[PDB]
């Protein structure tokens, strides 16, 4: 099995985001999201699956942060500027169906950042990027 | 918009279930899960969508509880005996794809109960079952 422990950092008091969805994809015997010590913990049955966290702010901004294991290495991706019909479960499935999202996963990134239309930065960084017990920060700008 | 507030009652100390997944379907401008006063609150952009909570126990038992609004009337369903590849996002989608799940939604039930293979009962009952501010109890046997 693989475990990914996520710590969320909010750095900019001009907005406040909260988690509104937590999904788990069906490959590699699936998995489970839980919370321990204010950390989001994803456990997976093997290499080849993932889970998505969707966040929303009161001002309308939202994004997905997805974490998983591809070919025995960690991966991550962030999607911003979400339409109302782009929920976390939609985004999670797209990593296994939609070519551009598939490629984002196959890159096996231990770090990724991107801005939304308003210019806000979002970053995922793995502070423990090796082995089966993986650790990442999600930093909101 | 519609809101469904869910209260979880675990009545049997021979096991402990916890939420491991919360999904939101893409119709009716989607929506959001949040937590207020230890309650799971699903907000939806209108009539015509739903969200799924998946629970897992340490003994291997698991189930999904799905809540939504269909043509302005609330609905619910429970699926038990989940395989490893039947995650919450898989089940949530099946209510708009698969015949027996679709029919469950169309029944617009204000209460439903079912047993798993081990004989444990699970029930959903809406205690506020009309209007836009709906309240439901999820009762684990
Ligand atoms: C060992 C491993 O990572 N296997 C995965 C598989 O489970 C699946 O995610 C696929 C993409 O659909 O890529 C790889 O074959
Ligand atoms: C601005 C934005 O959200 N860009 C995302 C990018 O971060 C990446 O996730 C890609 C593949 O999924 O899709 C979108 O282009
Ligand atoms: C107003 C309303 O509830 N409309 C829904 C629609 O959104 C969709 O969920 C469909 C399911 O196939 O059923 C109803 O037509």
Write out the residue range of the structural domain in which residue A107 sits: 1-141
Contact B126, B110 (CB under 8 A): yes
Residues of chain A contacting B, Cβ within 8 Å = 18, 20-27, 29-34, 45, 54, 56, 84-90, 92-93
Taking any CB pair shorter than 8 Å as contact, residues of chain B touching chain A are: 18, 20-27, 29-34, 45, 54, 56, 84-90, 92-93
Indicate the SS3 state at residue A99: helix
Structural domain total, chain A: 1
> Where would I find the beta strands (DSSP E) of B14-120?
17-24, 31-36, 39-44, 50-57, 62-70, 73-80, 111-115
* Number of neighbouring beta carbons within 10 Å of residue B57: 16
Chain A residue closest in CA terms to B29: A84
Check CB contact under 8 Å for A84 and B45: yes
Cα–Cα distance for residue pair B105/A121, rounded to 1 Å: 40
Sheet bearing A39-44, strands edge to edge? A31-36, A39-44, A2-10, A133-140, A121-128, A111-115
- Give distance in angstroms: CA of A137 to centre of ligand 2: 19
Q: How many beta-carbon pairs below 8 A join chains A and B?
A: 77
Please enumerate in sequence order all residues whose Cβ is within 8 A of that of B120, keeping only pairs 6 or more positions apart, or say none: B12, B15, B61, B80, B140, B141
Q: What resolution in Å is listed for this PDB structure?
A: 2.0
Residue B123 distance to chain A (closest CA, Å): 23
Experiment used for this model:
X-ray
Look-up: residue for tokens 């998505």?
A52
CA distance A140 to A130: 24
CB-based burial, A26-53: b 16+ in 10 Å, e otherwise: bbbebbbbeeeeeebebbbbebbbbbbb
User: Which residue blocks in A19-65 are alpha helix, DSSP H?
Assistant: none
Asked if A89 lies within 8 A of B24 by C-beta distance, the reply is yes
Are B77 and B102 in contact by the 8 Å Cβ rule? The answer is: no
Nearest to A97 by CA among A45, A44, A47, A27: A27
Please give the structure tokens belonging to residue A127: 């502070």
Residue B31 · residue B24 · CB < 8 Å: yes
DSSP class per residue in B99-114 = HHHHHHHHT--SEEEE
Distance CA A140, CA A82 (A): 16
CA B27 to mean position of chain CA atoms: 16
Q: In sequence order, what are the beta bridge partners of A51?
A: A24, A67
The position carrying tokens 């989607």 is: B30
The CB-side HSE value for B94 (13 A sphere, CA atoms) comes to 17
Give the CATH number of the domain where residue B71 resides.
2.60.270.20
Residue A138 in tokens: 């999600």
Q: Give rounded-to-5 percent helix, strand, coil for chain B.
A: 10, 55, 35
């Amino acid at each position: 099995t693989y475990k990914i422990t996520v710590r969320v950092y909010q750095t900019n008091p001009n907005a406040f985001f909260h988690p509104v969805e937590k999904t788990v994809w069906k490959y590699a015997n699936g998995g489970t999201w839980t919370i321990t010590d204010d950390q989001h913990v994803l456990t997976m049955g093997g290499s080849g699956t993932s889970g998505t966290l969707r966040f929303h702010a009161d001002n309308g901004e939202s994004f997905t942060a997805t974490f998983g294991v591809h070919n025995y290495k960690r991966w991550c991706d962030i999607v911003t500027n979400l339409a109302a019909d782009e929920t976390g479960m939609v985004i999670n499935q797209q990593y296994y169906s939609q070519k551009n999202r598939e490629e984002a996963r196959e890159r096996q990134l231990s770090n990724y950042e991107v801005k939304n239309a308003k210019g806000r930065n979002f970053e995922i960084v793995y502070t423990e990027a090796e082995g089966n017990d993986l650790h990442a920060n999600l930093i909101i700008g």
